[PDB]
């Protein structure tokens with residue numbers, strides 16, 4: 001009278017299908033998901049400093065659209081631009097909008113230092129009913145509309161050296177009147193010009209007289225430009241008309257700041273990774289939520305699921321039915 | 322699998338075994354019983370936990386990047402921005418697909434391996450006192466009471482004790 005000893009392995013009633021070298025589907029005892037495919041719908045307010053733009057684009061906040069004055073001197077790790085946002089100041093354009101938006105978004109700050117520019121022989125602080133500020137007409141907070149004094153617009157020629165140890169960002173512009181009457185009425189000279197220069201670079205913009213579409217009470221436009229001035233360099237502004245002058249400079253930082261377009265509400269929670277769909281967990285290596293991400297995120301992939309086998313081959317006993 | 326134990330010479334698994342991954346089933350004078358093997362079970366799990374921690378190993382923290390959605394048709398520069406991102410995603414999609422394929426092929430082969438390692442270890446314990454039936458079962462050629470079975474399972478079985486008894490039963 002002997003004895004038998006059988007070796008074997010476990011199995012489970014509910015197995016999981018996985019992919020391998022040789023099989024597109026094959027059953028295992030357990031697997032785990034490597035693609036994060038869902039979000040809370042909400043952007044967690046920690047650990048990143050989230051700044052909700054609300055009614056404002058970063059650019060309108062930069063310039064100082066009156067309804068965006070609450071963003072003066074603000075800072076962020078992630079500026080969040082909403083689809084509901086609108087401009088409500090003088091109508092403007094930014095040649096290379098994308099780049100100004102990017103470089104500011106990256107800088108992570110709207111810190112503005114006012115400087116004492118001396119505009120000899122011109123009227124300052126021009127305004128418009130396009131850009132109301134309280135009951136009366138107004139203008140962008142960080143720009144200074146210059147028009148004639150008496151009946152003359154002299155050659156403006158001013159300097160502002162950088163004796164700090166940080167880069168200065170100057171934001172300035174040029175006014176494009178709709179009619180020749182307007183050009184001369186505001187600036188005397190029939191053709192203006194704005195030349196903004198440092199030691200290394202220069203920008204010269206000729207204004208262009210012509211109607212544009214009527215937008216917030218005006219067929220005119222202001223074009224926006226920027227000049228960065230390095231430590232030890234100098235800024236020169238030379239204009240005989242149409243200058244929209246800076247009031248100072250924005251401070252520039254470098255770091256982890258960015259910008260995102262999203263209508264997800266901001267909530268109280270902690271999530272390292274942010275998408276426009278909302279925050280997502282980062283325990284998995286991959287994600288299918290959105291290619292746009294910010295922070296410590298899983299890598300975006302096209303697959304909505306990838307199962308990593310965490311168990312042997314599942315072999316249930318030979319079924320009689 | 323590469324070793325052909327799991328889904329191979331062992332016809333199927335045991336839904337009954339809820340206390341381990343690999344193990345033993347016996348029939349002797351005193352009845353039948355089941356016990357899981359802790360060492361082989363732990364080796365499979367440790368290796369799988371090992372690779373799991375490696376795969377979920379956080380890398381990748383990105384802040385300011387490029388824009389990836391556009392409200393205007395712009396042409397060349399935007400074509401390039403899209404192409405760069407589309408190129409990236411396809412390459413990461415491939416790395417993901419290959420990763421799981423390789424990992425899962427290997428997970429299956431290594432669990433198959435551990436089953437085989439336990440089987441070969443057990444056969445070696447029994448020396449000339451048992452024979453491989455060919456289905457993952459050894460026919461032992463002697464009286465093996467529950468003390469004797471547990472000796473095989475906890476690794477203390479002396480084959481000399483039962484050798485003359487067993488050798489006789491094999492060739493008679």
Ligand SMILES: CC(=O)N[C@@H]1[C@@H](O)[C@H](O[C@@H]2O[C@H](CO)[C@H](O)[C@H](O[C@]3(C(=O)O)C[C@H](O)[C@@H](NC(C)=O)[C@H]([C@H](O)[C@H](O)CO)O3)[C@H]2O)[C@@H](CO)O[C@H]1O
Pocket residue numbers: 126127128129130137145147177178179182186217218220
């Ligand atoms: C058919 C017709 O009427 N054509 C336009 C005419 O409407 C237009 O007049 C302008 O109308 C707007 C409202 O739509 C403003 O009221 C303009 O006045 C102000 C302004 O508030 O914007 C007054 C303000 O004091 C001015 N500021 C300075 C610093 O000069 C500004 C400013 O000059 C203009 O915004 C410059 O574009 O205007 C009022 O003039 C005229 C104006 O060019 O054009 C006809 O063709």
Ligand SMILES: *[C@@H]1O[C@H](CO)[C@@H](O[C@@H]2O[C@H](CO)[C@@H](O[C@@H]3O[C@H](CO)[C@@H](O)[C@H](O)[C@@H]3O)[C@H](O)[C@H]2NC(C)=O)[C@H](O)[C@H]1NC(C)=O
Pocket residue numbers: 157158159234236
């Ligand atoms: C417009 O404004 C700018 C800046 O305010 C003026 O530039 C300055 O021009 C003067 C000469 O016109 C330069 O002076 C020179 O300085 C050197 C030493 O650095 C000296 O050796 C020379 O003998 C000479 O005097 C000065 O460097 C220069 N500075 C800058 C920052 O540009 C410009 O003259 C103004 N022009 C008009 C028409 O108003």
Ligand SMILES: *[C@@H]1O[C@H](CO)[C@@H](O[C@@H]2O[C@H](CO)[C@@H](O)[C@H](O)[C@H]2NC(C)=O)[C@H](O)[C@H]1NC(C)=O
Pocket residue numbers: 072073111112113114
């Ligand atoms: C934004 O912050 C700056 C400082 O980073 C403020 O500028 C100071 O303003 C005071 C009061 O007018 C001046 O006396 C100082 O000279 C400025 N500081 C420096 C370092 O130049 C500015 O007032 C802030 N603005 C808002 C709206 O908060």
Ligand SMILES: *[C@@H]1O[C@H](CO)[C@@H](O[C@@H]2O[C@H](CO)[C@@H](O)[C@H](O)[C@H]2NC(C)=O)[C@H](O)[C@H]1NC(C)=O
Pocket residue numbers: 037038039276277288289290
């Ligand atoms: C995350 O958000 C994007 C949109 O912001 C979702 O993708 C869009 O939805 C449908 C397809 O399901 C399409 O009509 C859109 O064109 C898609 N846009 C893009 C850019 O692909 C996406 O499904 C959301 N994912 C989750 C998990 O919420």
Ligand SMILES: *[C@@H]1O[C@H](CO)[C@@H](O)[C@H](O)[C@H]1NC(C)=O
Pocket residue numbers: 030031032033310
């Ligand atoms: C199987 O893996 C899942 C994750 O997909 C996990 O929740 C669970 O703990 C595992 N189950 C067993 C029986 O080990």
